[PDB]
């Protein structure tokens, strides 16, 4: 309740996120997440064990309810925050939709603008405040086993989706350079491997690693490999916060610690592991679910449970982490961001891309 009649921050393949540059208290220490560009009969039934959710008139209530009633059950309220729907004037959105641009990338602006056809939107806490913030999009930290992975593709079990992906990514000139990062070290649950992988991240950040100083981006994009001058540049900007060219071994170590310590990565890999069958498997259920033939036996309910659980792992595989630091002794909050319910149609796309990735990496040999 209130209706609206804000400075650029970030943007994934869904929302614009802007920060609050004003003096109002309900809005201070907040950020507003805006949509770019309300359930299929099949979605309603997949998510039907929660009526409030399946009843939703628009996404804002939807994500909000999803996160609160589907996810928070799984991750606890500590690192999660459901969001606050909030009214908006269509004219508001157009106004912003120009205040944007600029910092805005291009291959991105291309695909999507702001959805001027919502009058709703999400307000969230600005985990870049309380300061040095890290955001990790870890991606998937495990390997499959599922007896539904073809024989032809026996690498899906020995080489991570992320790693196989970088290759293709490359062929398509998304990234100029293979990433060092191995989501396995990170989800490996050991202090030693955590740090390996966060150095990996610093090293070549891409769209996984990002650092924020009083809300201001000082490392990260996605990006190409950290050229040594950016090193001194970044190590420079550190001068102050950290008492120590060592401020940057120490800082990574400081991240290593909070990530491993909070053990937030574990209470995550579990949800990611809800993908019990892998898309090669789960795709068959999807078609039965929707009423068509698996162009690639269990009761309707088990199939549904399966596709459903897949989509929740799917949420957890595409989320990001935020770690904040203050005051050597430091404070820190870890929070999850980007915990969206995935469209049921993505099942065809999920499988599409998987097919393509495993097929390309299989060639490479």
Ligand X SMILES: Nc1ncnc2c1ncn2[C@@H]1O[C@H](COP(=O)(O)OP(=O)(O)O)[C@@H](O)[C@H]1O
User: Contact positions toward ligand X, by CB under 6 A?
Assistant: 9-15, 17, 31, 33, 124-128, 135, 320, 337-338, 340
* Residue whose CB is less far from ligand X, 60 or 126: 126
- What are the helix and strand counts (H, E) for the chain? 15, 10
- Rounded CA-CA distance 282/130 in Å is 41
From the CB of 362, what's the least distance to Mg ion, in Å?
A: 29
From the CB of 32, what's the least distance to Mg ion, in Å?
A: 16
* Residue whose CB is less far from ligand X, 219 or 285: 219
Residue 294 known to bind ligand = yes
Site mask for Mg ion (CB under 5 A), range 288-327, x = bound: ----------------------------------------
Closest CA to 40 of 307, 270, 264, 244: 307
Residue 169 known to bind ligand = yes
From the CB of 8, what's the least distance to ligand X, in Å?
A: 10
Q: Which does 56 bind (CB under 5 to 8 A by kind): Mg ion, ligand X, none?
A: none
Residue 58 known to bind ligand = no
Pair 211, 193: CB distance under 8 Å: no
Phi, psi of 192 (to 5 degrees): -65, -35
Tell me the three state secondary structure of residue 23: coil
Residue 362 known to bind ligand = no
Strand 216-219 versus strand 211-213 pairing type = antiparallel
Q: Is 11 in the site for Mg ion (CB under 5 A)?
A: no
- Rounded CA-CA distance 11/108 in Å is 9
- Rounded CA-CA distance 209/239 in Å is 20
Q: Which does 10 bind (CB under 5 to 8 A by kind): Mg ion, ligand X, none?
A: ligand X
Residue 364 CB contacts under 8 Å (≥ 6 apart), including other chains: 167
Q: Which does 11 bind (CB under 5 to 8 A by kind): ligand X, Mg ion, none?
A: ligand X
Residue with tokens 């495990």: 142
Residue 207 known to bind ligand = yes
Angle between helices 278-290 and 346-363 (to 10 degrees): 150
From the CB of 16, what's the least distance to Mg ion, in Å?
A: 12
Pair 81, 124: CB distance under 8 Å: yes
Q: What is the largest CA-CA distance in the chain?
A: 63
Residue 338 known to bind ligand = yes
* Residue whose CB is less far from ligand X, 176 or 216: 216
Residue 33 known to bind ligand = yes
Tokens matching residue 292:
């068509």
Pair 241, 235: CB distance under 8 Å: no
Q: Is 338 in the site for Mg ion (CB under 5 A)?
A: yes
4, 8, 12, 330: which one binds Mg ion (CB under 5 A):
12
From the CB of 19, what's the least distance to ligand X, in Å?
A: 7
Which segments are annotated as binding site for substrate? 108, 139, 169, 207, 318, 342, 346, 350
Which segments are annotated as binding site for Zn(2+)? 284, 294
Which residues in this chain contact Mg ion in the complex, by CB under 5 A?
12, 338
């Amino acid at each position: 309740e209130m209706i609206l009649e804000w400075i650029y921050r970030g943007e994934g393949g869904a929302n614009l996120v802007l920060a609050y540059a004003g003096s109002s208290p309900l809005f201070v220490g907040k950020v507003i997440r805006i949509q770019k560009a309300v359930l299929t009969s099949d979605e309603q039934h997949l998510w039907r064990e929660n009526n409030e959710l399946i009843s939703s008139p628009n996404k804002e209530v939807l994500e909000q309810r999803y996160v609160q009633n589907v996810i928070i059950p799984l991750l606890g309220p500590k690192h999660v925050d459901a969001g606050v729907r909030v009214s908006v004037s269509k004219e508001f959105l157009e106004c912003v939709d120009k205040k944007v641009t600029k910092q805005r990338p291009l291959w991105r602006v291309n695909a999507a603008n702001v959805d001027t056809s919502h009058d709703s939107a999400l307000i969230l806490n600005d985990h870049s405040l309380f300061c040095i913030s890290v955001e990790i999009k870890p991606k998937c930290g495990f390997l499959p086993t599922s007896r539904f992975i073809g024989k032809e593709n026996i690498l899906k079990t020995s080489v991570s989706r992320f790693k196989m992906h970088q290759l293709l990514k490359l062929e398509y000139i998304e990234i100029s350079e293979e990433s060092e990062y191995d989501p396995l070290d990170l989800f490996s649950g050991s202090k030693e491997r955590v740090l390996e992988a966060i150095k990996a991240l610093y090293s070549t950040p891409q769209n996984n690693f990002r650092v924020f100083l009083n809300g201001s981006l000082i490392l990260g994009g996605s990006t190409g490999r950290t050229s040594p001058e950016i090193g001194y540049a970044f190590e420079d900007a550190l001068k102050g916060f950290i008492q120590s060219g060592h401020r940057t071994e120490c800082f990574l170590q400081l991240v290593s610690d909070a990530v491993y310590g909070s053990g937030v990565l574990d209470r995550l890999l579990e949800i990611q592991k809800l993908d019990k069958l892998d898309i090669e498997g789960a795709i068959h259920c999807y078609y039965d679910i929707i009423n068509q033939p698996c162009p690639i036996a269990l009761p309707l309910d088990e199939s549904l449970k399966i596709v459903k659980e897949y989509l929740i792992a799917a949420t957890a595989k595409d989320c990001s982490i935020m770690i904040s630091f203050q005051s050597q002794t430091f404070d820190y909050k870890v929070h999850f961001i980007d915990l969206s319910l995935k469209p049921l149609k993505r099942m065809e796309s999920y499988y599409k891309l998987d097919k393509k990735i495993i097929s390309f990496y299989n060639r490479k040999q």
